[PDB]
Amino acid sequence: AKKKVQNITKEDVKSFLRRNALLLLTVLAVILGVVLGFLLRPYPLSPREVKYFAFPGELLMRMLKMLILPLIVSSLITGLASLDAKASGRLGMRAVVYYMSTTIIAVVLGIILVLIIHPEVLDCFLDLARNIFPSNLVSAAFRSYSTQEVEGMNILGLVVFSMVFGFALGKMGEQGQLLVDFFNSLNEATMKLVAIIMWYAPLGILFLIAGKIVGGQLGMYMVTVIVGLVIHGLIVLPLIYFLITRKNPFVFIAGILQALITALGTSSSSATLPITFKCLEENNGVDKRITRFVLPVGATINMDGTALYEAVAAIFIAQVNNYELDFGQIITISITATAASIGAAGIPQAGLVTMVIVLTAVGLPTDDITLIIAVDWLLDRFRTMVNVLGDALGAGIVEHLSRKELEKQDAE
Amino acid sequence: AKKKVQNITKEDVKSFLRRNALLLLTVLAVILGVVLGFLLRPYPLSPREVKYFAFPGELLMRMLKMLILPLIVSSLITGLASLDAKASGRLGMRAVVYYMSTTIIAVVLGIILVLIIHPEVLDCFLDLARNIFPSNLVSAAFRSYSTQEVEGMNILGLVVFSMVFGFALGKMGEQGQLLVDFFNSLNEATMKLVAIIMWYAPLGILFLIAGKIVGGQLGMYMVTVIVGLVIHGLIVLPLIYFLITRKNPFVFIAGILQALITALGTSSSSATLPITFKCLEENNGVDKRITRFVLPVGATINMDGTALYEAVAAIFIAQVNNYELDFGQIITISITATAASIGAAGIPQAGLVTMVIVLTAVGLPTDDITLIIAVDWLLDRFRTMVNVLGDALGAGIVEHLSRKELEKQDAE
Amino acid sequence: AKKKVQNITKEDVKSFLRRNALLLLTVLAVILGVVLGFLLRPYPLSPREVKYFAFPGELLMRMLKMLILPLIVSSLITGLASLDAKASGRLGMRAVVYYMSTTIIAVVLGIILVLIIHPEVLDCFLDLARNIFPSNLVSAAFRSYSTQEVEGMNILGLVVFSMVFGFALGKMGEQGQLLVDFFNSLNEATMKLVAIIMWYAPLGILFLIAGKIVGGQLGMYMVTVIVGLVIHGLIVLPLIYFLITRKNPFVFIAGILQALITALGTSSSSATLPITFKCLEENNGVDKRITRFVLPVGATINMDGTALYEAVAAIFIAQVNNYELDFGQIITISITATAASIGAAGIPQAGLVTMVIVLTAVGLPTDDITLIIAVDWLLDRFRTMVNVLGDALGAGIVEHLSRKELEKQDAE
Ligand SMILES: COc1ccc([C@@H]2C(C#N)=C(N)OC3=C2C(=O)C[C@@H](c2cccc4ccccc24)C3)cc1
Ligand SMILES: COc1ccc([C@@H]2C(C#N)=C(N)OC3=C2C(=O)C[C@@H](c2cccc4ccccc24)C3)cc1
Ligand SMILES: COc1ccc([C@@H]2C(C#N)=C(N)OC3=C2C(=O)C[C@@H](c2cccc4ccccc24)C3)cc1
Ligand SMILES: N[C@@H](CC(=O)O)C(=O)O
Ligand SMILES: N[C@@H](CC(=O)O)C(=O)O
Ligand SMILES: N[C@@H](CC(=O)O)C(=O)O
Ligand SMILES: [Ba+2]
Ligand SMILES: [Ba+2]
Ligand SMILES: [Ba+2]
Ligand code: NA
Ligand code: NA
Ligand code: NA
Ligand code: NA
Ligand code: NA
Ligand code: NA
Ligand code: NA
Ligand code: NA
Ligand code: NA
Structure with a gap:
């Protein structure tokens, strides 16, 4: 009731509009985008024409993707060279502890919410290990291994090498x-x-x-x-x-x-x-x-929103299948949904592709992923925001906890 | 009559032969090349054997292509960093104005010469825009987009990024x-x-x-x-x-x-x-x-000779087809031949591939390009010389016009 | 008899075990590897399962391959910039003379041992020349030419350019x-x-x-x-x-x-x-x-063990075929086995692929290579050790012979 009576003062909105020009424009872009998309939704236009329509949004993707490579490589090489090897282990332990805890907390919350509301796989592990150790750095910059080298930058390999x-x-x-x-x-x-x-x-x-x-x-x-x-x-x-x-x-x-x-x-x-x-x-x-x-590390391994979605969808497909609830097999879901969270790359539709790991572990059929494909895109947009938000708050949390190491490096 | 009587003096040819050793050797290479090629022209030799024959000329191509990438990237990064942002806009406006005028003058001259002597396409625009903004810099160094990523260096993408x-x-x-x-x-x-x-x-x-x-x-x-x-x-x-x-x-x-x-x-x-x-x-x-x-910019967008050839060939195919001469549709030819000139990459046979744009715009059939393929190679050799000559004279023209900006940067 | 009575002193083995921990571990890795492999040899396991088994050895390959590119490029650029152009020619002549002599001596020894114990190709030369002059440096880092560009780093092209x-x-x-x-x-x-x-x-x-x-x-x-x-x-x-x-x-x-x-x-x-x-x-x-x-040069051209194997196998296949012994055609074998030694890349199974050159030159059928494929892997493991040993001793030989040039560069 105190913040409510404080909000009625009509103070400083012109200063807010001037300063937050770009911030409010992207919010307006979402408002206009939803309106335009639903207005143009009756589609006598082919997927080819859909690609033509979405082209201004495609140029933004090429522009952002362009910078990913010099951004990761320069950030980790300088960042880790800036710090003393022992301080880097301290900073690292803070990151790893924060990452695993938040992912464990999201998968537990995810399992609780579904148990209340009722709405090869080995080759995957080897491909991941293969990508942690790229055989060629120039190729790693635009290709990843898939059992033999599929297109698309090996972010993990470059993260590790840098x-x-x-x-x-x-x-x-x-x-x-x-x-x-x-x-x-x-x-x-x-x-x-x-x-x-x-x-x-x-x-x-x-x-x-x-x-x-x-x-x-x-x-x-x-x-x-x-x-x-x-x-x-x-x-x-x-x-x-x-x-x-x-x-x-x-x-x-x-x-x-x-x-x-x-x-x-x-x-x-x-x-x-x-x-x-x-x-x-x-x-x-x-x-x-x-x-x-x-x-750069949080962007690939710290996937809080993906982990919550992995647990929710692994139990949701079991509802239709009427699969038995085992006290020890739900423990394997929390374990493999945390495993798939770390695994899944920071790219669109990577959540659904890593569901193969979590569906196999329990004993559910992997062909059920087809049912969840239609709605996925919208859940992916939200899952990504939680995966990013985790790295953002994670940086703020680590920075605050590591102020002693940062004050030592500020000596000269 | 004054330069003629001056030419008879037989003065300084030994100094010319000593100094211009390499220059005269490449001229002799053209003379010996034309003689050898016509001498060896009766071909009981397969295209495989033709590739074997032309191999010394192929090594020169690999050698020149090798240096293109470090040459463009280092030239534009240093060159634009050397100049003040406002001076770079001034230099840029001089270049752009020179480029568009010379290309507009070549296409007008080209149209006049043919009107006196009577001898998908949207996907192309999007592919160009896609290449101006490469999604990966390492891949941009040896691949270009084609609607999905064809081989061959994306010079334009690197020109823009540099x-x-x-x-x-x-x-x-x-x-x-x-x-x-x-x-x-x-x-x-x-x-x-x-x-x-x-x-x-x-x-x-x-x-x-x-x-x-x-x-x-x-x-x-x-x-x-x-x-x-x-x-x-x-x-x-x-x-x-x-x-x-x-x-x-x-x-x-x-x-x-x-x-x-x-x-x-x-x-x-x-x-x-x-x-x-x-x-x-x-x-x-x-x-x-x-x-x-x-x-590096002139090499890809300043194509004076290609523009003249685009107009000539767009009207030449219409002669056979007996296509009507519209006062407003000839204006579309001068516009799309200037458009294709800018578009077409600085590589062999790129002129004929961009004719698809100029033939579609007027309303002529694109399958007529097949008629012009046989003779193209020789016209391409000449078109390239005019495309290069334009960048060379263009540099000389801009340097002279920008002597004030160059004298300011020479202070220290 | 003097070194034998000296060996019985049981002196300093604890200091040897402490110091040579890693050296003895890799020797033990060979001992345990041979034991494990023969123990697990009865194979109710598919080649897919063989790949799964050999995976820890595969990660070592990716790790070593990773560093090859920054190692060659940085070594030759600094190394040749460190030396005076004339000293680099002197050092070079010492290397080339050592390389050709040792390869000529191995092929002669190889021919003598087989003559006592009786147990397209032009496209190959052009592909080699094409690779000495790469058309793209970024692509050269992960691809080689093969008549059109096969996967796998062009070491030779990078060696030459660096x-x-x-x-x-x-x-x-x-x-x-x-x-x-x-x-x-x-x-x-x-x-x-x-x-x-x-x-x-x-x-x-x-x-x-x-x-x-x-x-x-x-x-x-x-x-x-x-x-x-x-x-x-x-x-x-x-x-x-x-x-x-x-x-x-x-x-x-x-x-x-x-x-x-x-x-x-x-x-x-x-x-x-x-x-x-x-x-x-x-x-x-x-x-x-x-x-x-x-x-970096010795690793690709100085192949002493491959040359000995090329001569041995070129004469061994002729034993079965009962091919006539020509005093002048054995001279072509010593010439083409030295040629293939230089040619063959420093990668596994490259010896057998270059046998195409040596089998064609004499007049033997290239399809006979199939007979030698089964046992090759073990001979390749040994051939590689002799190819490496040659570069190692070669460095020691050149360093010793070039002490004057090295003492001049140590002035300051
Ligand atoms: C595969 O996914 C990862 C990669 C990295 C990390 C941590 C991290 C973050 N965030 C960053 N930037 O660096 C290090 C981390 C360590 O825990 C260890 C830390 C470290 C300390 C001291 C010496 C090191 C030497 C080599 C590599 C890491 C080292 C570096 C966690 C998971
Ligand atoms: C796609 O085809 C092109 C690319 C470039 C150009 C011009 C050019 C030439 N020649 C070069 N070297 O630089 C700039 C040009 C400008 O007009 C603008 C100029 C410029 C001035 C000030 C700030 C800039 C910031 C970023 C990019 C260009 C900028 C640079 C013309 C067409
Ligand atoms: C294709 O297989 C090869 C490549 C290289 C070599 C020799 C070598 C070794 N080992 C190294 N590191 O450098 C040079 C060599 C020369 O003989 C010549 C020497 C050299 C001296 C002076 C100027 C040069 C300028 C350019 C290139 C080499 C030059 C360099 C031999 C065979
Ligand atoms: N697209 C998500 C990951 C996922 O697909 O779950 C992200 O990049 O954050
Ligand atoms: N080959 C020409 C362009 C064209 O094909 O028209 C050049 O590089 O200048
Ligand atoms: N594998 C050998 C070459 C060969 O195959 O003969 C090496 O790298 O030394
Ligand atoms: Ba420091
Ligand atoms: Ba300055
Ligand atoms: Ba020096
Ligand atoms: Na987390
Ligand atoms: Na993330
Ligand atoms: Na992840
Ligand atoms: Na022009
Ligand atoms: Na040009
Ligand atoms: Na052009
Ligand atoms: Na040798
Ligand atoms: Na070697
Ligand atoms: Na070799």
């Missing part, structure tokens, strides 16, 4: 410094390009979401995850940030708002990574030393 | 300088390699042209463009250079002679770019700051 | 130094990663050899080459090193032992190159200036 290379340069001293300085100039220069890409974003988001918007049991399921992601995203994660930092978490979420709205549009944790960087480094004022450490 | 990256580094100051210095050493080092490639050029040009030389209406057509390119190339463009600089243009053409003779052999504006660089920077003494700005 | 680039930077002075320093930091940093890869090697070698171990005339043939490689490897090459340096060669072989045991496991001169570098630079204390000069 880290080991970063540690090596840190151990080289002065001889190493030249290369650390080379990669620092390349990071800031690609960060300077994401400033340009940001002005195109409202035009892109409008067309990217408008194009995608062009039995009843699958209906209740969509409502389950959406509710589950609001509990984790807007209630679980903020109180975690508040409990650790003692800072207002909803003001932090306001800073990374452009990153969430772009995640909602692209449905890629990797594509929105350059914008998550711009938001945290600037708007939230997070340290570059730790955003370069947390964000 | 420019935006160059502007970014220029805005970084000292932090940026390291990377600008890194790309400056990489430019001069690859420029040092083109000095070596130049000694192989006479052997390559000989075999490259000899291999290619191994109804009657298509006969008069070939004579139309050849005459049209001599009017534009040796009369239109030199008087433009003279009107702007007041310097003798045929002495400038003498400096870039090795670049034209290599264009005549390869039929690629991109492949002869490292040699156009060596000729302008040295022989013509043009500024590196502006050759790095003009030449 | 050398020409190294010479260019050396001729640039100070402007060049930045890039030389850039590539020096990148060499030491990738050399710092091979230290990590080395700890995985015993686990990898165990599984790499165990997986591969899972008429009678082809039996005697295998014994011929194995004996021939022991004569060249353990008798011919050491006395050559002793005659040149006057240093004990079997103490040198002890230093590069990890490199030979890894060659025995991988059967790739290129994959074991980062470990041959670590052994020579450290264990044998060879100069970085010359290991960067000798080793």
Whole structure:
């Protein structure tokens, strides 16, 4: 009742409109995009014509994807070279502990919400191990292994190599410094390009979401995850940030708002990574030393929203199948949904492809994934926002916990 | 009558032979190549054997293509970082204005010469836009998009990215300088390699042209463009250079002679770019700051000879078809032939592939391109020389017009 | 009798076990690998399951292959920039003379051993020439030409380009130094990663050899080459090193032992190159200036063991065919087996693929290669050890012969 009477003052909206021009434009892009897409929905237009329509949104995807490679490689090489090897292990343990806990908490919340509301696989593990260790760095930049090398950048392989290379340069001293300085100039220069890409974003988001918007049991399921992601995203994660930092978490979420709205549009944790960087480094004022450490790793392994969706959908398909509830086999679901969360790449429709792991483990048929394909796209847009939000709050949490190591490196 | 009596003095030919050793060798390579090719023309030898024969000319192509990538990327990153953002816009406006005017003048001359002597397409625009914004920089270095990613370097995508990256580094100051210095050493080092490639050029040009030389209406057509390119190339463009600089243009053409003779052999504006660089920077003494700005851009968009050929061939196929002459539809030909000129890549047989755009716009059948395929190769060799000559004179024109901006950067 | 009574002292084995922990572990990996492979040999397991089994050995291959590219490119660019152009020709002549002589001596020894114990092709030359001059440097990093561009790094193309680039930077002075320093930091940093890869090697070698171990005339043939490689490897090459340096060669072989045991496991001169570098630079204390000069070149052209195997197998298939012994045609075998040695890439099963050249030249049928395929893998493991051992002793021989040039560069 106190904040309500405070809200009626009609104070400073002209200053807000002037400052938040771009932020409000992308919000308007979502509003206009939903309106346009539903207006143009009666489709006497072929999928070829759908591709033609969504083209302005496609150029935004090419623009964002462009920067992913120089962004990850320069961030981890400089970031890990900036820190002392032992401090990097400390920072790393903070990240890993935060990642596993938040993913374990999301999968438990996900299982509880479905148990209340009733709405080869070995080759996958070897392909993952194969990608952690790329045989060629030039090819790793635009191809991933799939048992033989499918198209699309091997983010994980580059994440791992850049880290080991970063540690090596840190151990080289002065001889190493030249290369650390080379990669620092390349990071800031690609960060300077994401400033340009940001002005195109409202035009892109409008067309990217408008194009995608062009039995009843699958209906209740969509409502389950959406509710589950609001509990984790807007209630679980903020109180975690508040409990650790003692800072207002909803003001932090306001800073990374452009990153969430772009995640909602692209449905890629990797594509929105350059914008998550711009938001945290600037708007939230997070340290570059730790955003370069947390964000490229969080974008591929820290998938809180995917984990919640993996558990929900693994139990949802079992409802139709009338599969028996085993006290020990539900434990395998929480284990494999956390496993698939880490595994699944930060790219669209990667959630559904990793369901093969979680469906096999329990003993459910993998061909049931076909039922969940139709509605997936909308749940993917939301799942991505929670996967990004986790890396953003994760950076804020780690930065706060690692202030001693950061103050030592600020000596000179 | 005064220059004629002056020419009879038999003075300084031994000094000319000693100095112009390489220049005269490549001229002799064309003379020996035409003789050898016609001598070996009776072909009881398969296309496989033709490939075997033309192999010394193939090694020259691999050698020149090799350097294109480090040459474009280092030239635009340093070149645009060297200049103040506002001066880069001034230099840019001079280039764009020169490019569009010369291309508009060539297409008008081309249309006049044919109207006196009577001898999907949307997917193309989207593919071009897609290539201006590459989704992966490593893949952009050896692949282009074609609706899905065909082989062959995306020169345009790299031209655009290098420019935006160059502007970014220029805005970084000292932090940026390291990377600008890194790309400056990489430019001069690859420029040092083109000095070596130049000694192989006479052997390559000989075999490259000899291999290619191994109804009657298509006969008069070939004579139309050849005459049209001599009017534009040796009369239109030199008087433009003279009107702007007041310097003798045929002495400038003498400096870039090795670049034209290599264009005549390869039929690629991109492949002869490292040699156009060596000729302008040295022989013509043009500024590196502006050759790095003009030449990589001119090689892909400034296609004067292609534009003249596009107009000539669009009207030539209509002669056979007896297609009606519309005052407003000839205006669409001048517009789409200028459009295709900009579009068409600086690689062999790219002129004929972009005829699809100009034939569709008017309302002529695209399957008529098959008639023009046989004679094309020879017209392509000449068209390329005019496309290169335009970038060479264009550099000389811009350098002269931008002497104030260049004198400011020479302060220290 | 003097070294025998000296060996009975039971002195310093605890110091040896502590120091040579890793060296003895990889030896134990071979012992355990042979035992495990023969134990698991009864195969009710498919080739798919064989791939699953050999997976720890596959990760070692991806790890070693990863570093090959930054290792070759940084070694030759810095190495050749470090030296004066004339000194590089001197060092080069020492290498080339050593390479051709040792390969000529191995093929002569190989021919003698078989003549005592009786147990298109033009397209190949053009493909080699095409690869010496790559048309694209980014593609050269992960593809080779095959008449059109097959997968797998073009080591030769990068070896050649890095050398020409190294010479260019050396001729640039100070402007060049930045890039030389850039590539020096990148060499030491990738050399710092091979230290990590080395700890995985015993686990990898165990599984790499165990997986591969899972008429009678082809039996005697295998014994011929194995004996021939022991004569060249353990008798011919050491006395050559002793005659040149006057240093004990079997103490040198002890230093590069990890490199030979890894060659025995991988059967790739290129994959074991980062470990041959670590052994020579450290264990044998060879100069970085010359290991960067000798080793990347030796890994592809200096194939002593392959040459001996090429001669042995070219004459062995003629035994079955009862092909006539011509005094002049045996001279063509020694010539083409030396030719194929240089040609054949430092990768597994490359020896048998280049037999096409040596079988055609004499007049034997190329389809006979099928008979030698079954036993090849084991002979390849040994052939590789002799191909590596040659580069290792070659570095030691060149370093010793070039001490004047090295002492001049140590001035400052
Ligand atoms: C596969 O998914 C990953 C990769 C990385 C991480 C952690 C992380 C984050 N966020 C980053 N930036 O660096 C390190 C991490 C460590 O736990 C360990 C830490 C580390 C400390 C000290 C020395 C190291 C040497 C090499 C590599 C990592 C090292 C680096 C977690 C999961
Ligand atoms: C697609 O085909 C092209 C690309 C480039 C150009 C012009 C050109 C030439 N020649 C070069 N080297 O740079 C710039 C040009 C401009 O007009 C604008 C100019 C510019 C000035 C100031 C800031 C900029 C920031 C980013 C990019 C270009 C900028 C750069 C013309 C057509
Ligand atoms: C295709 O297989 C090869 C490539 C290289 C070599 C020799 C070698 C070794 N080992 C290395 N590192 O460099 C040079 C070699 C020369 O003989 C010549 C030497 C050289 C000296 C002076 C100037 C040069 C300029 C460019 C290239 C090589 C040059 C370089 C032999 C065979
Ligand atoms: N598309 C999601 C991952 C998923 O498909 O679950 C993301 O990039 O965050
Ligand atoms: N081959 C020409 C372009 C064309 O095909 O018209 C050039 O590169 O200049
Ligand atoms: N595999 C051998 C070459 C060969 O196949 O003969 C090596 O790399 O040394
Ligand atoms: Ba430091
Ligand atoms: Ba400056
Ligand atoms: Ba020096
Ligand atoms: Na998590
Ligand atoms: Na993520
Ligand atoms: Na993941
Ligand atoms: Na023009
Ligand atoms: Na051009
Ligand atoms: Na063009
Ligand atoms: Na040899
Ligand atoms: Na070798
Ligand atoms: Na070889």
